[PDB]
Amino acid sequence: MKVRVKAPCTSANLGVGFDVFGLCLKEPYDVIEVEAIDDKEIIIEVDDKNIPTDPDKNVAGIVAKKMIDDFNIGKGVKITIKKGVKAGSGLGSSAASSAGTAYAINELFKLNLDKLKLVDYASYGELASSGAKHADNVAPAIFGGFTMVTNYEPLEVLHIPIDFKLDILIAIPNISINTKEAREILPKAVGLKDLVNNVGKACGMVYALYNKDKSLFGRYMMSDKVIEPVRGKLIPNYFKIKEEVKDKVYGITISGSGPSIIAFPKEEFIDEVENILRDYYENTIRTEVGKGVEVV
Amino acid sequence: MKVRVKAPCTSANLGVGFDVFGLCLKEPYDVIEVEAIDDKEIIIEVDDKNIPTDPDKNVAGIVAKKMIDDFNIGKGVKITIKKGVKAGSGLGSSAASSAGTAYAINELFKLNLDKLKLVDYASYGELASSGAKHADNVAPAIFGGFTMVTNYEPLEVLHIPIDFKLDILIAIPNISINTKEAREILPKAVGLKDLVNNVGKACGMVYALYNKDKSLFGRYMMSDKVIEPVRGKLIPNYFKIKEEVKDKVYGITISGSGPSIIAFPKEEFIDEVENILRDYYENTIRTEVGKGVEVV
Ligand SMILES: Nc1ncnc2c1ncn2[C@@H]1O[C@H](COP(=O)(O)OP(=O)(O)O)[C@@H](O)[C@H]1O
Ligand SMILES: Nc1ncnc2c1ncn2[C@@H]1O[C@H](COP(=O)(O)OP(=O)(O)O)[C@@H](O)[C@H]1O
């Protein structure tokens, strides 16, 4: 009763898709192992003793429990957690654990849940650990590709497979941003003009995915005037880099609530763009769209 | 030396697609004839006396001048118009004349302009006549099917052809709402949550069209809380009607600024739905998605 699997990072928001859009990455990823023990305890082994190891406080511990209850495994569990990336950087670090955790269980013991259900319980973890469902990082972690959380209370997720090559460059500033503090600057109200702008550009991005038009997808992604102009201020040199790689990327925007940045470099400039990101920030990752948590 | 065209009515907004979405109807439509005449003058005749004949006021005369001017055409034109529906009903009556004229001029004088440019020209009629360059009704009138105006300067239109069966029922109350009236009902600001809600649902409608899922398309269409709740109050029996056809349609909402109502009846209830609308509004018409202006 052992399961080893990869739970990938994800990038939520993608500019105009704030709180709806999610893109699953191939890397980084949390490598998680969950062997089924006999006793009734929840044991957490997580490198970087910065991640709460107490089952009720750790995200994977929360998902883990609530799922055994509902499926009455009457067993406890030990969790081997190899962190793919630092929390508070905007790459769905936590979401990776939740979805990784939930997918494990289901794969393991003959359970035959729905990817949507897994996304559901997994949210329990981002919710029971942050007070919000946030299926937007969890949904792509599970479905892979591109996802849209179009409804909560109940939960609905629309999935669009990315069948073409989409190169992705990620830069991770050695800075931390309080996900919460950057909520209050987030306006409580918006003008009709922005409703119209964001609805149009986001819809245009769905159209771009169906037409495999990366240029159109990336350009509309960078059209938000509501959240990005505010959140961007906290990211050192973000606006300057955007302008600098302007003609060398299909698009570049903040990943989740930041400070991590996600860019879609043009084939002809992947090396150069990756270098520019390395000079400003120091940590850069070259990846592409992933297919979500899969048994390793 | 003349051309005659059928220019369709159109339905904009479609609930959560305010100022973005547009659906072309097959009927009603304007029948417009344009004849190249020798004196450099613009003569306009119409069968609706509540509509101007002054070339600088009739939307058709405004579009024709702008094009004749830009292309330095030597001739003048006689425009004869048979109206499909009254203005002020939310069915894009003015747009039908504007799009129809731009399309007819382009045919008569062999300008070979692409559809996007004909929508841009048709847009002057909408502006020069109603103060704002709006293209969400002229876009579907020129392109047919479903359109998204995703940028206004420069103008950008994304077209999604509808190749599956989509029955439409239109109820036209004997009331009118002009452009100043339309603006009056509009909220000053929108909450962040509504923005997120409309972005998600509008994006789901696009996903629905690519997946030919009429149930999903209609359901998300009925999700707006920003404008429909206020606008519906202006239409006698609207909420009551919506409730009455509740499980017999894929969706029902207001057409454009209203007061007309657009419904997408489920195939097994089309006659029953048409009769219910008809009990409330005599001027009810059955139609389907149109292909845009066409030479007749
Ligand atoms: N398995 C886990 N992986 C990562 N972070 C966890 C986990 N379990 C609990 N946490 C804690 O929850 C908090 C989550 O921060 P968070 O805003 O969710 O990061 P992120 O925005 O990358 O998803 C952190 O303080 C972290 O220590
Ligand atoms: N060819 C035309 N067809 C329809 N309306 C026109 C035309 N030329 C000018 N107008 C005027 O412009 C105004 C447009 O009202 P409007 O809100 O644009 O109707 P609609 O919303 O159906 O397009 C009316 O007062 C109308 O008389």
Side-chain angles (χ1 to χ4, degrees):
Chain A
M1 312 306 256
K2 171 199 173 79
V3 130
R4 197 165 178 279
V5 76
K6 305 175 180 178
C9 279
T10 55
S11 177
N13 295 358
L14 300 174
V16 295
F18 181 73
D19 283 342
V20 176
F21 290 4
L23 188 68
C24 182
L25 304 185
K26 195 181 175 183
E27 309 128 283
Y29 60 55
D30 271 2
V31 167
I32 172 186
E33 181 175 297
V34 164
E35 309 174 310
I37 55 180
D38 293 308
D39 56 311
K40 306 189 178 193
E41 280 81 66
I42 298 179
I43 297 182
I44 304 173
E45 303 189 13
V46 178
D47 59 66
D48 174 21
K49 211 311 169 184
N50 212 306
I51 298 93
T53 51
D54 156 39
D56 195 352
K57 192 69 177 183
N58 187 301
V59 168
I62 303 181
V63 181
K65 62 190 61 174
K66 176 54 186 172
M67 284 182 76
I68 301 175
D69 160 304
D70 298 38
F71 289 69
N72 314 302
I73 313 176
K75 295 180 181 175
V77 193
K78 286 192 177 182
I79 310 171
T80 309
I81 288 174
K82 297 180 171 62
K83 109 173 189 176
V85 72
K86 63 196 97 170
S89 51
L91 295 167
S93 196
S94 167
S97 287
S98 310
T101 288
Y103 178 76
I105 315 308
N106 175 77
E107 251 302 305
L108 270 165
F109 338 99
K110 318 266 175 150
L111 318 76
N112 293 322
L113 322 178
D114 266 323
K115 298 186 179 183
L116 179 55
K117 191 57 195 156
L118 297 186
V119 170
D120 203 5
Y121 280 134
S123 335
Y124 225 77
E126 305 293 296
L127 182 314
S129 171
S130 74
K133 291 300 180 176
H134 297 323
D136 52 315
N137 272 288
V138 177
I142 295 296
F143 285 87
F146 176 88
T147 60
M148 301 184 291
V149 181
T150 55
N151 203 65
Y152 287 104
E153 348 119 5
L155 173 83
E156 278 185 84
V157 173
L158 305 178
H159 175 228
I160 302 174
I162 303 303
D163 54 282
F164 54 84
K165 191 98 156 75
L166 183 55
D167 291 305
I168 298 166
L169 244 22
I170 296 301
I172 312 174
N174 282 311
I175 255 271
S176 173
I177 283 177
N178 178 342
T179 304
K180 303 199 174 185
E181 294 176 319
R183 294 180 183 193
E184 314 205 297
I185 321 182
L186 228 58
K188 269 197 59 179
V190 168
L192 259 183
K193 288 173 187 177
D194 298 304
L195 171 61
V196 177
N197 182 68
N198 283 33
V199 165
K201 297 292 195 302
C203 282
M205 282 170 81
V206 180
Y207 170 95
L209 289 186
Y210 281 105
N211 282 266
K212 303 170 187 163
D213 191 338
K214 298 188 277 197
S215 183
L216 179 65
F217 184 78
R219 176 166 61 83
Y220 283 5
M221 176 192 256
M222 307 190 281
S223 309
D224 176 41
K225 295 304 168 225
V226 173
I227 295 193
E228 167 164 337
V230 177
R231 249 171 201 176
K233 282 173 171 166
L234 302 177
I235 304 176
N237 291 303
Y238 169 67
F239 296 127
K240 184 166 183 184
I241 284 197
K242 189 182 172 174
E243 174 68 19
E244 177 172 354
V245 304
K246 179 182 46 181
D247 303 305
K248 307 176 174 146
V249 304
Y250 289 111
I252 179 170
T253 196
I254 299 162
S255 179
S257 58
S260 281
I261 294 160
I262 178 167
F264 298 116
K266 294 183 174 159
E267 291 81 346
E268 158 167 57
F269 305 97
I270 181 166
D271 293 308
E272 180 182 348
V273 175
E274 167 152 43
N275 291 339
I276 296 174
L277 293 170
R278 292 256 201 56
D279 305 332
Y280 277 85
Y281 309 120
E282 272 219 74
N283 318 309
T284 280
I285 290 177
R286 177 179 311 200
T287 188
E288 68 188 86
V289 183
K291 293 187 185 180
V293 193
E294 72 181 9
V295 210
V296 61
Chain B
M1 196 87 96
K2 59 185 173 174
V3 65
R4 179 159 156 274
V5 74
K6 256 184 173 185
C9 281
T10 52
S11 182
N13 299 341
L14 299 184
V16 298
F18 178 65
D19 263 24
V20 177
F21 292 357
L23 186 66
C24 195
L25 302 175
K26 188 174 186 170
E27 309 126 285
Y29 51 84
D30 279 6
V31 174
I32 302 176
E33 173 173 300
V34 182
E35 215 186 63
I37 57 179
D38 301 279
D39 6 310
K40 301 161 54 186
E41 184 174 63
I42 293 180
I43 293 177
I44 297 170
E45 305 180 10
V46 204
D47 63 333
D48 185 330
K49 294 198 151 188
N50 303 275
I51 292 173
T53 273
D54 177 341
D56 297 326
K57 286 180 170 187
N58 186 299
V59 104
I62 299 181
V63 170
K65 184 184 194 295
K66 182 52 163 174
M67 296 180 77
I68 277 152
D69 279 7
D70 291 359
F71 291 91
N72 295 302
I73 283 158
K75 323 169 189 175
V77 301
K78 181 182 192 169
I79 304 172
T80 306
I81 304 165
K82 303 193 178 189
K83 294 296 300 183
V85 81
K86 51 167 179 284
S89 51
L91 294 167
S93 170
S94 181
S97 279
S98 294
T101 296
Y103 176 111
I105 300 311
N106 183 70
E107 290 300 305
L108 183 55
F109 301 116
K110 273 43 177 181
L111 305 183
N112 298 296
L113 271 5
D114 74 0
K115 285 171 175 162
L116 179 59
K117 187 57 160 170
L118 298 184
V119 169
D120 190 56
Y121 272 121
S123 266
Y124 282 70
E126 296 287 45
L127 162 53
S129 181
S130 84
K133 259 224 188 184
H134 305 291
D136 53 313
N137 277 282
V138 290
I142 287 287
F143 283 88
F146 182 87
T147 56
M148 310 187 303
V149 174
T150 59
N151 209 66
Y152 281 104
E153 187 179 322
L155 179 72
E156 290 185 55
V157 174
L158 301 180
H159 177 222
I160 296 172
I162 301 290
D163 42 64
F164 54 95
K165 186 69 184 170
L166 185 60
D167 292 302
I168 296 167
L169 248 27
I170 301 296
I172 306 169
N174 203 211
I175 311 160
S176 74
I177 292 170
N178 60 31
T179 60
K180 64 183 197 192
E181 288 170 303
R183 279 160 49 226
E184 292 271 25
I185 70 183
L186 264 23
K188 170 179 176 173
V190 181
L192 228 212
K193 177 192 178 177
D194 294 324
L195 172 79
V196 171
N197 174 76
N198 286 17
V199 171
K201 301 298 192 307
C203 283
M205 285 170 78
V206 174
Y207 168 95
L209 290 177
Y210 283 103
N211 280 282
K212 309 181 180 165
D213 186 347
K214 285 188 279 190
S215 303
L216 180 57
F217 182 80
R219 182 166 56 91
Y220 280 2
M221 177 189 254
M222 301 192 275
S223 296
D224 182 49
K225 299 311 183 164
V226 177
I227 294 181
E228 175 164 329
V230 169
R231 215 184 285 275
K233 279 159 74 194
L234 308 181
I235 306 177
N237 301 302
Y238 178 66
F239 295 109
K240 180 168 192 164
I241 286 179
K242 188 178 172 181
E243 187 65 36
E244 193 153 334
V245 306
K246 175 189 167 182
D247 298 292
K248 307 177 175 159
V249 302
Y250 288 121
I252 180 178
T253 195
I254 297 170
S255 169
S257 285
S260 291
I261 302 171
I262 176 168
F264 298 104
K266 284 176 168 172
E267 297 90 327
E268 70 181 296
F269 303 101
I270 182 169
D271 297 304
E272 181 186 352
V273 175
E274 184 175 354
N275 287 321
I276 294 178
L277 285 175
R278 213 159 243 141
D279 288 337
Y280 289 96
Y281 293 106
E282 295 170 55
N283 195 1
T284 285
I285 84 171
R286 170 185 301 192
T287 188
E288 50 177 318
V289 183
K291 288 302 180 54
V293 186
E294 57 176 283
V295 166
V296 292

